[PDB]
Amino acid sequence: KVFGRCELAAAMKRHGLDNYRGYSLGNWVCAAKFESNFNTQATNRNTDGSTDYGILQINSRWWCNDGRTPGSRNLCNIPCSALLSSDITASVNCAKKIVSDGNGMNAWVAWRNRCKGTDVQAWIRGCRL
Amino acid sequence: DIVLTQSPATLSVTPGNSVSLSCRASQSIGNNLHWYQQKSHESPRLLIKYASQSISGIPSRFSGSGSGTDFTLSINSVETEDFGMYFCQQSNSWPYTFGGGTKLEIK
Amino acid sequence: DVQLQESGPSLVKPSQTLSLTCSVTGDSITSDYWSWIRKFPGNRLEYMGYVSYSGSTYYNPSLKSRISITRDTSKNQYYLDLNSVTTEDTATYYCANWDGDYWGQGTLVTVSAA
């Protein structure tokens, strides 16, 4: 599914990401925008053999298990295929575990390069939440 | 810290009746609230995650609802194995905290 | 499947260091985040801290920095050290994964001059 910006912001708010572990809501929207262009089905094969899945491009080497990745650790104890759904529930569940590590949102490289240090609340402005 | 207040502190009930436990947060925590059961001489058991996400292996009579600051754990026709303590827990902010507990006791 | 088990002393004296071990069986400790929770005598639960996959640690500020959590990847165990205990540290300690699905059985530790 291709979420609109406002649509995604209200869903992520309903899924409890506004102020989760010190991160304001716009961080999550901006991250989804640069990680997957708001596409729940996005996939990206990495040179190391892992794949990045879904709206938050969650990696198969550490977080979910797609059965094809070498040192898979499955930290979110979930099959990768559950992250490729139009329902964001499982993506948000795993993302909350990912950000609870001391690396916080720095695990998402597009967030790191395009969002950190920017006015991230701009991503939720002009939206009915 | 987020303070979590649970009510009633004690609930006496007859098996086959339905109950609702309440848990209120001092600040808005979205859906970041989990519910545990603790029976005598046993480790806590996770019943509900993220306010209403049901968990595999636990009776369907338990359901949770709520968001923000007000959350409820409901038990449709309580059974004798349900008697014990119920605690809510927020994971929105660090340090994670627990509510003071509801004791569920046979009438 | 995964099993967790607490061990250490059940009786300690005031001001010493309490060390507990959590033994994990069924999967590696590198595959999750791991925590320590304790229950006081009147059913009061306190989340103590957790160690995440990168080795970073989060500790409850109610412990004033007397706690250390560490893990041993070759033994498949992780640990709790609590310095300068007092009688207020008398409690049931549990280890559990972060998700809250696996818990150990719990170990009662009593703090007393004796």
HEC per residue, chain C: CCEEEEECCCEECCCCCEEEEEEEECCCHHHCCEEEEEEECCCEEEEEEEECCCCCEEECHHHCCCEEEEEECCCCEEEEEECCCCHHHCEEEEEEECCCCCECCCEEEEECCC
Q: What is the DSSP letter of A59?
A: E
Chain A hits for B30, Cβ within 8 Å: 13, 15-20
Q: What is the DSSP letter of A82?
A: G
Of A7, A52, A87, A119, the catalytic one is A52
Signed CA dihedral, A55, A56, A60, A65: sign only: negative
Residue A22 at interface with chain C, using a CB cutoff of 8 Å: no
Tokens representing A27 are 């961080």
Q: At C102, which amino acid appears?
A: Y
Nearest to B31 among A16, A19, A21 (CB): A16
Q: Calculate the alpha carbon distances from C77 to B50, C21, C34 in Å.
A: 29, 7, 10
Give bridge partners of residue C81 from the DSSP assignment: C19, C68
Contact B93 A16 (CB under 8 A): no
Radius of gyration, alpha carbons of chain C: 13
By the 8 A CB rule, do B84 and B66 touch?
Answer: no
The C-alpha atoms of residue B24 and residue C63 are separated, in whole angstroms, by 25
* B1-107: in CATH 2.60.40.10: yes
Q: What are the φ and ψ backbone dihedral angles of B95, each rounded to 5 degrees?
A: -105, 145
Collect all residues with Cβ–Cβ distance below 8 Å to A96 and sequence separation of at least 6: A16, A17, A20, A21, B32, B91
Nearest residue to B32 (alpha-carbon basis) of B72, B74, B67, B75: B67
Q: Which helix (H) or strand (E) holds A28?
A: helix A25-36
Measured in whole angstroms, the distance separating CA B58 from the mean position of its chain's CA atoms is 13
Chain C hits for A65, Cβ within 8 Å: none
Number of Cβ atoms within 10 Å of the Cβ of A52: 22
A101 is in an annotated binding site: yes
Residue A16 at interface with chain B, using a CB cutoff of 8 Å: yes
Number of domains in chain A: 1
A7 among known catalytic residues = no
Instruction: Tell me the count of B-C CB pairs closer than 8 A.
Output: 44
- For chain C, give every domain's residue range: 1-114
Nearest to C62 among B49, B89, B95 (CB): B95
Give bridge partners of residue C110 from the DSSP assignment: C11
Number of Cβ atoms within 10 Å of the Cβ of A96: 19
Q: Which helix (H) or strand (E) holds B74?
A: strand B70-75
Nearest to A20 among B51, B53, B92 (CB): B92
Signed CA dihedral, B33, B37, B38, B43: sign only: negative
Tokens representing A123 are 């991503």
Q: How was this structure determined?
A: X-ray
Q: Resolution in angstroms for this experimental structure?
A: 2.3
Count CA atoms within 13 Å of residue C102 on its CB side.
21
Number of Cβ atoms within 10 Å of the Cβ of B50: 19
Contact B95 C105 (CB under 8 A): no
Residue A58 at interface with chain B, using a CB cutoff of 8 Å: no
- Just give the CATH number of C1-114: 2.60.40.10
Tokens 């004033």 sit on residue: C64
- For chain B, give every domain's residue range: 1-107
Of A7, A18, A35, A66, the catalytic one is A35
By the 8 A CB rule, do C13 and C110 touch?
Answer: no
Number of Cβ atoms within 10 Å of the Cβ of C52: 20
Number of Cβ atoms within 10 Å of the Cβ of B83: 18
By the 8 A CB rule, do A75 and C32 touch?
Answer: yes
By the 8 A CB rule, do C51 and C32 touch?
Answer: no
Q: Calculate the alpha carbon distances from C94 to B65, B92, C21, C80 in Å.
A: 28, 22, 10, 10
Tokens representing A125 are 């402005």
Nearest residue to A83 (alpha-carbon basis) of A97, A70, A71: A97
